[PDB]
Amino acid sequence: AASLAPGSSRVELFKRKNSTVPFEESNGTIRERVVHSFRIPTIVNVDGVMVAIADARYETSFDNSFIETAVKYSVDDGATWNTQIAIKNSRASSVSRVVDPTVIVKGNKLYILVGSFNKTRNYWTQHRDGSDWEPLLVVGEVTKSAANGKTTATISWGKPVSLKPLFPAEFDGILTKEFVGGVGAAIVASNGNLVYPVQIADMGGRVFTKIMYSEDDGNTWKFAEGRSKFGCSEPAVLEWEGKLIINNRVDYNRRLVYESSDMGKTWVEALGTLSHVWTNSPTSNQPDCQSSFVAVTIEGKRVMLFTHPLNLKGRWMRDRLHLWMTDNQRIFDVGQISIGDENSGYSSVLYKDDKLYSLHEINTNDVYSLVFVRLIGELQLMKSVVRTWKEEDNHLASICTPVVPAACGAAVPTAGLVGFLSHSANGSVWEDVYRCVDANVANAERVPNGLKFNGVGGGAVWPVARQGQTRRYQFANYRFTLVATVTIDELPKGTSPLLGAGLEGPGDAKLLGLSYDKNRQWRPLYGAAPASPTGSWELHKKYHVVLTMADRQGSVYVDGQPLAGSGNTVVRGATLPDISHFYIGGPRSKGAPTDSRVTVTNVVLYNRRLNSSEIRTLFLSQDMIGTD
Structure with a gap:
């Protein structure tokens, strides 16, 4: 594919300077407020409801502006949407904000982790200390019911809870400063364990990744011992054949990927599989970008989906967003899932009820909308190659070899x-x-x-x-x-x-x-x-x-x-x-x-x-x- 596969298409679900969101005043009143940009898309499925999560960046697209977590949900496969503002900022300054939503679905529930800032004007990792910041956890409960022949769903957003007093002051003798989820969608592990990839900024401003995981459902949290090389940021995670796979954003180099057999305690780099396969740009020397990473079962086969701007234009333009499938051996390009040469960005992908979707950014003069895309072409193209592998494999696994003289041998x-x-x-x-x-x-x-x-x-x-x-x-x-x-x-x-x-x-x-x-x-x-x-x-x-x-x-x-x-x-x-x-x-x-x-x-x-x-x-x- 060169651009968006024919038979696939999209609508502007979160339109810049257009879509009001229900903003809640100090004194409880709700007011339809215009939003400059929407950014940081994550689309997941909860119990049949499509949940779309984004930064509502009210005033400006600047990372350090007035932001709150916005939520749009649908019970008719994106045919129609409900719009909420799921997480309020502290309202302490003109720049108070809740950012970088990271998501874990478990049953009828949503776990969202966002960094929370009060007054600071500059990027979080450059902060003199971690005093402006708080890592907030919020639990979204989805309830389904039915009217006069219509399916209705509502969503309670619980009270936020700072995870701050569980942030160890030092990592192996490296003074930590602040941390944030890795942005986008995360996972539930095999043992029903809640698993965030976090990004951790030390006092010195250097940056690295980790696994924060809970055994008791958001209740309490533990930081796994293993980590990445510095320069890793915005990590994505999926569970695969025992291990976690951690696909990192890496500014001005290639994307380091690590495997962890022991639930985060010790990490090894996926040298002989996925590490270094993806980068930030043709020359590998431009800023990186966020990427979604999830396990889907296509045609019965267990595979892995990855999204990423080819970003030719360089710097923070993030043109040409591609989709990829891998079964941890063959890595297949499924072409481009954005339109023309346009500037895309952060993205998310969802395979639910055997339809394929992406939510992702489009930026024009640093103004940001989230597009909602139906990848029906991209999916059959996917389902096709699965069979090739499926059957090409099964073909060689049921073949008869000569009894090694020591009806079939090996x-x-x-x-x-x-x-x-x-x-x-x-x-x-x-x-x-x-x-x-x-x-x-x-x-x-x-x-x-x-x-x-x-x-x-x-x-x-x-x-x-x-x-x-x-x-x-x-x-x-x-x-x-x-x-x-x-x-x-x-x-x-x-x-x-x-x-x-x-x-x-x-x-x-x-x-x-x-x-x-x-x-x-x-x-x-x-x-x-x-x-x-x-x-x-x-x-x-x-x-x-x-x-x-x-x-x-x-x-x-x-x-x-x-x-x-x-x-x-x-x-x-x-x-x-x-x-x-x-x-x-x-x-x-x-x-x-x-x-x-x-x-x-x-x-x-x-x-x-x-x-x-x-x-x-x-x-x-x-x-x-x-x-x-």
Whole structure:
């Protein structure tokens, strides 16, 4: 998709300088007050009622202006809305405010956490101290009933409650100052635990993330021990296969993502899955932006939805808002869910009653409306690819392999399976069997399950970092397993590459690789180390080949058995390498002319090191895993 998928559309639900909200005077009276901007959208579903939550920024769009939490709800799928003002500010100054609503749904309830300010004019993290501030919790109770054939719903907003006396004065010996929810929608954990991602600003003004979670339903709260690197802000959270996944906003760099198996107590970065995949702009050096992050079950499959402005225009413009789906392996772009080049911003997404929606910002001359969008196109597009994965997976999980001599032996494992170049191959493109990352081929000709490479400047360029702004195979730099079948057609002139991972920047350096020489021998390249000859292939014989990288250690495989110098290092120092792509054959443009005569079929890719028992299996099954 280039822009908002046809069959999908929107209305301005919170119109700048237009939509009054019921403002409540000091003395209880209610007055329809105009609102300059509305910002910070969050749309969730409570018991069949759609709840939309935003900052009502009365006077100006400035983060530090007169604000209160506004709520619009609907029992007819956004067909009509009720408008409330859910959280009042302290009314202490011209600038008193309640900001940054963060949301947890549980049954008929809403838990909203907002920072609360009295007098300060500047950004909260720059505050001399945390004296102006209070973190308020407020519980929204939704009641459903029915009139004369109409469904009616109302919503009590409870009294706010400062969480302040539970803010530890120091974190591991770092004096805390103030904290706020991470903005947008949060989650209920598996054990029915209330789980906020918070953002914490220390006395020094530096910024980092955490998990605040309650066991007893908002009642009391505890801060989990684990945290992020500084520079993380506006974190979003979703529970996934045991762990929490914390997707952070990171100003002027890429989006760090952490996994926590132990309910926040200790965090590890999702190097081999999602971390660093998303950033703030093409150049990664512009301010970031908020992102929604939630678990939905599409077609029966458990997946993850992410929203984020490509923000080309740079700085705080946040144009081109995209939607993404991932099942923690394949990351799929579902195109753009805003209109034209327009300036979007903060966003939220909702899949309820098998319809798909987003609430999100549109800004024009720093004036802000929330658009309400029906993504009916985006959804079928989604439901489609789910099936591909669903069935492409189920297809390989019910296949019969030869009883390893020690009716079927071992399963062909799909746990971690990411990429697949099999049959479907087109003009200059080896099509992804999972539809996420494509390949760009030269000098090819089709065979059952592959492509035969014949000519000058010809080979498959399966981009990894060379994907641009969104680095979907980033994970590779920490661990991966690349697989391929090969028939070798003609003896090389001297040496000519085949299967491996190329790096970025100067020259033409490689992480890991297996070239081949004119003596019928194997050329395992292990980083910049000399690839000394070994083994003996033969022209036109079918050959399985496996590349595993984990913990910087690498091995090459020719038919189950590893190659000379297996157990080598491929990167030095604590630095993560910058794998450009993967190479099938000999593609190039800078410098040397590669001319490779191989037939390469059924190329796999996992986000981890496949094991002894798995490598042995896949090796014996390479005709039972193809497609037509």
